Ligand binder design. Structure first.
Ligand SMILES: Nc1ncnc2c1ncn2[C@@H]1O[C@H](COP(=O)(O)OP(=O)(O)NP(=O)(O)O)[C@@H](O)[C@H]1O
Ligand SMILES: [Mg+2]
Length: 307
């Protein structure tokens, strides 16, 4: 009651007996599996991150600080376009349990499905990511690591921002350079407007079907490139309407860049007439079960319907 509000998010501790790992997804080693809350007659698809046991105690506390910090953030947020933490489990190694995003990160998704992503998907993704960031801004959260790789894909129609390792309250105090606002690189300044810049880069990643920003350019130069007024080039499928919104996100005066709530409005306008704003050959002809090896999927509930 001296300024900020108490964070009353619930931190759920889960038992190992309650979830079954099914398959490895990555290596912090991440499994796909199912979580069956005791006595609830539901099966919830989950990602289970089992932390690396770590050799050096300095590496140990680095792993653990990322883990507890992003457990704290994901437990405190609740929005259809941000990833929710379902719980943690304090076995010998700590495990973080999140809602399963079956289709992986969005960068790999647009890379692998270039020839079947239509303009309606692209623009709807832009709207959903801006809704997620607008929610974070409503909660005074600055993400500092927004990128296509940090957007996950529940369905082709539904994505969610993730990876809150670098997040912080707006006013508070204490490295992907090609996604960083200029004032982030020069003065270590981070705001919701620097997130807006990163959002511009992410949209450019999407519109280019996963190209690398400033490909082959060494990070040491990016700062001088940007002070000289250079920016990422207009993607081939982008009308000037879309590209111009993106370019506005990269203006040097952070207060001149658009706001996330403006970006929601503008991309929603454009998603009302997708083919007037992105030009994709064969657009009109583009389309997109037991994910586990379990034969009894009848009681499966998505985390979003259990909550
Ligand atoms: N809930 C989830 N559902 C499905 N896949 C996931 C989920 N969470 C993470 N992954 C993937 O599993 C791997 C673990 O990623 P992560 O633990 O976030 O490490 P990271 O280095 O921070 N990756 P990033 O957030 O993209 O910067 C990545 O390939 C993710 O895309
Ligand atoms: Mg992280």
């Amino acid at each position: 009651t001296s300024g900020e509000a108490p964070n009353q998010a619930l931190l759920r501790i889960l038992k190992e007996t309650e979830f079954k790992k099914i398959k490895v997804l990555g290596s912090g080693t991440v499994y796909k599996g199912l979580w069956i809350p005791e006595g609830e007659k539901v099966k919830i698809p989950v990602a289970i991150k089992e932390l690396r046991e770590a050799t050096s105690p300095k590496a140990n506390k680095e792993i653990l600080d990322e883990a507890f910090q992003e457990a704290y953030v994901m437990a405190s947020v609740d929005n259809p376009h941000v990833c929710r933490l379902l719980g943690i489990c304090l076995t010998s190694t700590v495990q973080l349990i999140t809602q399963l995003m079956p289709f992986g990160c969005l960068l790999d998704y647009v890379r692998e499905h270039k020839d079947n992503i239509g303009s309606q998907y692209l623009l709807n993704w832009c709207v959903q990511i801006a809704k997620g960031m607008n929610y974070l801004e409503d909660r005074r959260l600055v993400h500092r690591d927004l990128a296509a790789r940090n957007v996950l894909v529940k369905t082709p129609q539904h994505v969610k921002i993730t990876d809150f390792g670098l997040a912080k309250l707006l006013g508070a105090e204490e490295v992907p350079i090609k996604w960083m606002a200029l004032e982030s690189i020069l003065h270590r300044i981070y705001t919701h407007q620097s997130d807006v810049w990163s959002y511009g880069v992410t949209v450019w990643e999407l519109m280019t079907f996963g190209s690398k920003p400033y490909d082959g350019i060494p990070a040491s130069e990016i700062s001088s490139i940007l002070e000289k007024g250079e920016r990422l080039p207009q993607p081939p499928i982008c009308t000037i309407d879309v590209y111009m919104i993106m370019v506005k996100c990269w203006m040097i005066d952070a207060d001149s860049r658009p706001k996330f709530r403006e970006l929601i409005i503008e991309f929603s306008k454009m998603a009302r007439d997708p083919q007037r704003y992105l030009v994709i050959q064969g657009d009109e002809r583009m389309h997109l079960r037991a994910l586990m090896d379990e034969e009894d999927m009848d009681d499966v509930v998505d985390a979003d319907e259990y909550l």
